[PDB]
Amino acid sequence: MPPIRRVNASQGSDAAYQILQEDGCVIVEQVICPNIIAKISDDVNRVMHNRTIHMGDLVLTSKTYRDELLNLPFAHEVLEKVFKKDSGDYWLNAGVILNMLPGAEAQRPHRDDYLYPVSQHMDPATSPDLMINITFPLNEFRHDNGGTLLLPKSHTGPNADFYANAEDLPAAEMQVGDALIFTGKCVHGGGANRSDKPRIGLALAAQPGYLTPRESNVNVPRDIVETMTPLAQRMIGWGTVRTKDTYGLNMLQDKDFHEALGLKSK
Amino acid sequence: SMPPIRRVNASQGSDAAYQILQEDGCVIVEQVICPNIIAKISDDVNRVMMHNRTIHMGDLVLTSKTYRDELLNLPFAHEVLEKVFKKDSGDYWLNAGVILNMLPGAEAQRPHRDDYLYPVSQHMDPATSPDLMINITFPLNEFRHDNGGTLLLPKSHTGPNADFYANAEDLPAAEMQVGDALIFTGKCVHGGGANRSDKPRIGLALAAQPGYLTPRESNVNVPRDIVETMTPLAQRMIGWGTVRTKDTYGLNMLQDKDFHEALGLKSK
Ligand SMILES: [Fe+3]
Ligand SMILES: [Fe+3]
């Protein structure tokens, strides 16, 4: 298979986006200050299937997540390049800590967009991207500890019930401060953690606004939401999302979500 | 001549209406709801009294209790919606529920497909793809051709997406009484008609869609105590509930749990 190509965030989001569209995945090195990941990680530790812990409700868990990570400029630049023309505004499907314990088995390689049934009714070679996943290692990702397996350049062929054997796929190997980005059409799966320590990443899933988020955030206190940026509030569902035709979704009282509520931001 | 708008009495059961909807993209269901329930919703709607002389009014959950209880739970409508959405898509919920108050002087819309507003509809074959949306319109007063009754092109729901479908002036109108309903899909060519009368023509239009599509109309602003007087099904209709895809994956979940369980949401 082809290799998982890498780019430094210094090369600019358009360099990352270009590998994303040629390969369906890219590793972006030094995309964010390790101090931020370390702090989120600390917030998380203070707080299961296939020996893998999935933990969400990250908005309530880490101010650093609400402030720095949900606002990371490089990420939104890539997300805009993916979604704006074909789809319009975007927001979060879910933000989840993936804690992959030793003994976790590799996942069957798959396309994330199977979650939304319409992906099976559109030609992957031309359809809009329904999902972007950005995974930040909270510790080192290697092949031997379950680093995400990927099939580069698999994001345009036909939808299938079988794509590859996990054991044939290269692993995303990358450091705190880096991020892996792959699309809903990129064949991938969790790797096997054959090591003696957990492999922990923060996985943000973004998608067009016209797609219902998996993780609802209507439960966050409005006090806490009102310290976040307008962009971050929209990410967690507390804002109106417009389609590429400027059709407004998630409207309240027939007006933009923020105005109906009088929702303050920072 | 274009085909006529077929009708069936709700007493014939939802299979018969669904089968016409499958064949034609639209069906009129006669005596599907008790006219007195519609009258109740009409009193509420009037107690709160614009493009192309047509007034759109939303937020029906707050304005009318009969809407929340009787209309959002109408079993015949859910049977049809289940037959439309369950296998291909899964759970469904409301895009929006709107009063369409068409005032004297409104002009006939350009005939169109409602699913144009969902960008994915332009990437799927209309002949074979799932429906993205079902419109159900209850007349609050008589619909006739002369007062703007909805124009429809029966059997236009499997043709390719196009910039042009028909001239409004050639189209048959949905003519119906209080207690009836018009059901059509997001692929059926249709449009508001011209109200040449001197009285408003008022309908209540529900747009339902798969749960995996974001509703245009959010209801996170309805007081929780109102929502808790509603059935679990009506609560899901207005977005206060987890919706499951045809593969049973859950969306609109909270703390990785069912929306209701996570919240302690009481229901009627
Ligand atoms: Fe996955
Ligand atoms: Fe329409």
Q: How many Å lie between the alpha carbon of B243 and the closest alpha carbon of chain A? A: 9
Q: Do B117 and A87 touch (CB under 8 A)?
A: no
Q: How far apart are CA B19 and CA A216, in angstroms?
A: 36
Q: d(Cα A19, Cα A14) in Å, to the nearest integer? A: 9
Beta strand ranges found along chain A (DSSP E)? 6-8, 25-29, 52-55, 90-100, 132-137, 149-150, 179-183, 188-189, 199-208, 241-242, 248-249
User: How far is residue B103 from each of residues A143, A181, B48, B151, B168, measured CA to CA in Å?
Assistant: 67, 52, 16, 16, 18
Question: And the tokens for B102?
Answer: 């068409």
Residue type, position B6, single letter: R
Considering the domain boundaries, does residue A224 fall inside one?
A: yes
**Among A175, A103, A178, A187, which residue's Cα sits nearest to residue A140?**
A175
Q: Which residues are registered as beta bridge partners of A181?
A: A26, A134
Amino acid at site A11:
Q
Residue B248 maps to a domain:
yes
Q: Which residues pair with A53 in a beta bridge?
A: A99
Residues of B within 8 A of A212 (CB-CB) are: 211-214, 243, 251-252
Q: Which residues contact residue A223 at a Cβ distance below 8 angstroms, ignoring those fewer than 6 apart?
A: none
Amino acid at B76: F
- Please tell me which residue of chain A has the smallest CA distance to B57: A254
Q: Please check whether residue A73 lies inside any domain of the structure.
A: yes
Contact B146, B196 (CB under 8 A): yes
Q: Residue A212 is nearest to which of B58, B59, B251, comparing CB atoms?
A: B251
Residues 6 or more apart in contact with residue B101 via CB below 8 angstroms = B54, B55, B56, B57, B200, B201, B202
Residue A266 domain-assigned? Answer: no
Experimental determination approach used: X-ray
Closest alpha carbon within chain B to A236: B252
Distance from CA of B218 to the nearest CA of A (A): 5
The whole-angstrom separation of Cα B185 and Cα B25 is: 6
CB-CB neighbours of A107 under 10 Å: 17
Rounded to an integer, what distance in angstroms lies between the CA atom of residue A260 and that of residue A257? 5
Helical (H) or strand (E) element with B97 = strand B92-102
State whether residue A54 sits within 8 Å of chain B by CB: yes
Q: Beta strands of B103-153 (E only): which ranges?
A: 134-139, 151-153
Q: Is A171 on the interface with B (CB under 8 A)?
A: no
Q: Which 3-state string (H, E, C) describes A43-97? A: HHHCCCECCEEEECCHHHHCHHHHHCHHHCHHHHHHHHHHHCCCCECEEEEEEEE
Residue B252 lies in a domain: yes
Q: Which ligand gives the minimal distance to the CA of B150?
A: 2
Of A117, A214, A249, the CB nearest to B216: A249
Contacts of residue B263, Cβ cutoff 8 Å, sequence gap at least 6: A219, B254
Cα B208 from Cα A237, distance rounded (Å): 20
Q: Specify the pairing of strand B250-251 against strand B243-244.
A: antiparallel
Domain of A204, in residue numbers: 6-261
Q: Considering only CA atoms, which of A24, A7, A21 is closest in space to residue A187? A: A24
d(CA B85, CA B126): 15
Amino acid at position A85, single letter: K
DSSP, collapsed to helix, strand or coil, labels residue B149 as: coil
Is the CB of A121 less than 8 angstroms away from the CB of B119?
no
- State this model's resolution in angstroms: 2.2
CA of B241 to the centre of ligand 2 (A): 27
Q: How many CB atoms lie within 10 A of CB B103?
A: 18
**For residues B116 and B224, what is the distance between their CA atoms, to the nearest angstrom?**
33
A221–chain B Cβ distance below 8 A for any pair: no
Closest listed residue to residue B179, CA positions, set B151, B145, B137, B139: B139
Q: Domain containing B68 — which CATH number?
A: 2.60.120.620
Distance CA B148, CA B6 (A): 18
The minimum CA-CA distance between A257 and chain B, rounded to whole Å, is 8
In a domain, A77, yes or no: yes
Reference B47, options B67, B64, B61; nearest CA is B64
Assess contact for B183 and B80: CB atoms under 8 A.
yes
Of A212, A215, A253, Cβ closest to residue B243: A212
- Identify whether the C-beta of residue A59 lies closer than 8 Å to the C-beta of residue A67: no
Q: How many other C-beta atoms can be found within 10 angstroms of the C-beta atom of residue B55?
A: 16
Q: Is residue A1 part of a domain?
A: no
Taking a C-beta distance cutoff of 8 angstroms, is the pair B192, B106 a contact? yes
B250 SS3 class: strand
- What distances in angstroms separate CA A123 from CA A120, B51, B69, B81, one per listed residue? 8, 37, 42, 27
Between B214, B220, B250, which is nearest A241 by CB? B214
Residue B122, token pair as written in the block: 């332009």
Cross-chain Cβ contact A117/B88 below 8 Å: yes
Q: How many domains does chain B have?
A: 1
